[PDB]
């Protein structure tokens, strides 16, 4: 139970980081 | 509760609009 | 309800297949 809440937190942080990167790459293009 | 469901649905509405768009632009390519 | 479990597992499996497809096609475009 505690396992999944903590895994989700890490997964959301990585998706937020990748979203920022993709949006930076989008504008440079 | 109900307004977090209101927030969620609204975000899925706009994702549905964007999906139809992206499918159109893909066919045009 | 079960059906919702049934629908979600099917959609996730299909997303899993498609994800592999896309990464394989991405590797192909790279190399």
């Amino acid at each position: 139970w505690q396992e999944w809440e903590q895994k989700i937190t890490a997964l959301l942080e990585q998706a937020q980081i990748q979203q920022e990167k993709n949006e930076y790459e989008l504008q440079k293009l | 509760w109900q307004e977090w469901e209101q927030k969620i649905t609204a975000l899925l509405e706009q994702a549905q609009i964007q999906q139809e768009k992206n499918e159109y632009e893909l066919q045009k390519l | 309800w079960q059906e919702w479990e049934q629908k979600i597992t099917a959609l996730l499996e299909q997303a899993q297949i498609q994800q592999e497809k896309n990464e394989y096609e991405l590797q192909k475009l790279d190399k």
């Binding site: - | 893909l26 | 959609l11 475009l29």
Partner: protein, 44 residues
């Protein structure tokens, strides 16, 4: 180019798979929501 077009088609497809998975999860989440509220009435 031919590879990129097939990839782009799979990307748009993936977006549709993820969207539908989130929508189904939202219906399940709503069922659990009412299951809690009923339990909250029954014991609180």
């Amino acid at each position: 180019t031919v590879q990129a077009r097939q990839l782009l088609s799979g990307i748009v497809q993936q977006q549709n798979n993820l969207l539908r998975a989130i929508e189904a999860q939202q219906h399940l989440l709503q069922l659990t929501v009412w299951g809690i509220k009923q339990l909250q009435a029954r014991i609180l």
